[PDB]
């Protein structure tokens, strides 16, 4: 009962900033 673009849309749309946050560069 969850929209997969949504999940695109805050998985992987945040993931470009979260990358960061994660490598810590």
Not at 1 to 25: F, N, S
């Amino acid at each position: 009962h969850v929209d997969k673009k949504v999940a695109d849309k805050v998985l992987l749309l945040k993931q470009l900033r979260i990358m960061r946050l994660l490598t810590r560069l």
